[PDB]
């Protein structure tokens, strides 16, 4: 009963990692969209004073998300966030109850951060070889149960966690859209098209297929014109080996 | 009930922070040295495939961790082991039960994982300028509760996360070690001892007085030759503007 509201863009995968936990938790929330890369209202340092999309606050009396309560509690951190609502939503099973199985899902959730989600945003906003990341995402996929299913076996948080960043690789990719080469990006296009990828490709598709994932995304041709906007998206700049 | 074994070195920081936790938990475990960086053991990516410490192994027979069995569950990165070690252990309240608290303990996680520990490791590594360490420092210690206490109020495995790093840091400096320059070495030493940065040394103080600590720490001086072994600590070398 207590109120949620999330900050959000978007073009974000961050903010939409936490938009597919709430569905699956039946939550009651709202979303208030924030322009944080080009112009950031003066009063969002009080529900992040780290000036990063998303934001979260809980509890605190009803106001416009405008209007922030100094009483509400202040959450930050995307995965934090995913973490907070399966606590707070424990009859929607958003992780498994089985320890070895939730390690899963938390160990999913690091490969991700910390050997994936680095090569994205170089490749996209450096220009950086593709390779390293076609490498991490072939390790990622080697992580999922390789006769189908979610990273746990049951879809976890750790679903929302990923599927943000890989269901917008392909239609970017599709579009143009990012600082790496052309022929980087033929590279990325046939590498992800190829039976190398071929359980990756279930399990975008698994997660797609989720309604907390219809009810989060735009539409592919929307969300490449959301991630347009992006200033680091610098539109038509590439870089060569 | 069933088995731990937790493959270490006394190094790592990463693999400190899951014997922290393990002496936390009350927990019977077996530690193993791997020496990772320069003669890894050909069985050891049978327990972690990207060949890093720490590795887990969980169940199965005992066996010696050199020979470990194929049906132990095989658990990888530091903090999906931290997160493991709390399930496991409940009744040692390595979590708040609070969500709102446990939401403290994985922010205060994520920001050190986001915003410091990469500047920790490319000033050391590196040579990088100190201030933006500095600055994701400062911005860390103002997530602790300001009047004492832990990340999260009480303990938590979100401070088994981070003292690894903030430990090492002042033996580390106050030892020359790292490719800073010395310049930025004594902006650090200033800095680290300066009223900006008193709450952040009571919290090592704190963290530092409690057994899990002193029962995985080698002594100050043991540490810094440990560290001494790492390759990208190359002794004698020093990076400049
Ligand atoms: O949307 C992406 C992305 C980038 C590459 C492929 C697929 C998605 C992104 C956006 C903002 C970031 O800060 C970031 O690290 C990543
Ligand atoms: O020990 C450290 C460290 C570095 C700087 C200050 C304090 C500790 C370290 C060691 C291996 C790493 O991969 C890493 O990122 C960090
Ligand atoms: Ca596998």
Redesign the interface.
Known sequence: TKQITLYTATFSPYAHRVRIALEEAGAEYTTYDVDILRNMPDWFPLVN??KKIPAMT??GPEVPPDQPSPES?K???S???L??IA??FPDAKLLPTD??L??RA??F???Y??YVNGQFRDVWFLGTPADPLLQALE?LQ?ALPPDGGFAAGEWSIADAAVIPFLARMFPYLEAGLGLYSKEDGVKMRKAMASERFARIRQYVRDCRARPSFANTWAGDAEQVEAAKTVPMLRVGEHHHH
């Open positions: 004073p780290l809980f509890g509690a959450i930050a951190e995965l934090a966030m973490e907070f606590d707070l320890p070895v939730r390690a938390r160990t959730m690091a490969l951060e910390n390790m080697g």
